[PDB]
Write a protein that binds this ligand. Sequence first.
Ligand SMILES: O[C@@H]1[C@H](O)[C@H](O)CO[C@H]1O
Length: 271
Amino acid sequence: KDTIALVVSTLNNPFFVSLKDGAQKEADKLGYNLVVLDSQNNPAKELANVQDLTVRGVKILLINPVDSDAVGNAVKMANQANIPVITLDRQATKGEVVSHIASDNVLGGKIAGDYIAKKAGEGAKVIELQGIAGTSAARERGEGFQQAVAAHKFNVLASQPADFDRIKGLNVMQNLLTAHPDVQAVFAQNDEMALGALRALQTAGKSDVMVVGFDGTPDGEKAVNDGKLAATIAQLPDQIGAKGVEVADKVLKGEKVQAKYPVDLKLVVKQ
Ligand SMILES: O[C@@H]1[C@H](O)[C@H](O)CO[C@H]1O
């Protein structure tokens, strides 16, 4: 079997476990060996892993950067080895990349803000919990949300990163609530942060504050159905993973591959 490598930012997040599962299923179907290396949200690890894979002479690198700015040197190493690179979910700011497969995260952030305007109103007092700085996902969601802040004249009380992490989201939101008890709505750039924020708000007696997440993870979907999470923006991580392999196969066969394969997003609310 030929080997495709998948270098994933972390497997401590259900979104990325699903991404890996889609890649694996597709690899199995197309007859490739898939080597999955977990970067553990660590730029040093990501670099070591890519170096290892380039010396193993993998045929294609699928990479979900830890940091879109920091991954340039890892990608240049694959470039020097003539191993084509396909980015999944997050972009590489520098380096040669054959194809990028991700959600329209600008649109996602706009959709999230637009729903907050629908339910909390024009001029709502909002807090944004940002993802990992340096990731195109967080940057784009922030851009999309700012479009909503402008459109609907939101009062942004605070916008701070909680690193796509549930516990950080809890600690950051707890902290922000003390400064800004008048918050009316929160946009958390993933469901893990959203669920942390929800826990901080319940603790402070502010469970009336509307929260919108991102990803539509099983825990996000459950939280919507339970009435705790106002909404989430559903992504299709299995499809991002699968497409990565499908395009890797294409590249290897010399077929023409798009520079970008956008993957659909969907506002999810309780039915
Ligand atoms: O798209 C992904 C998901 O939102 C994940 O939960 C965090 O990283 C982003 O890049």
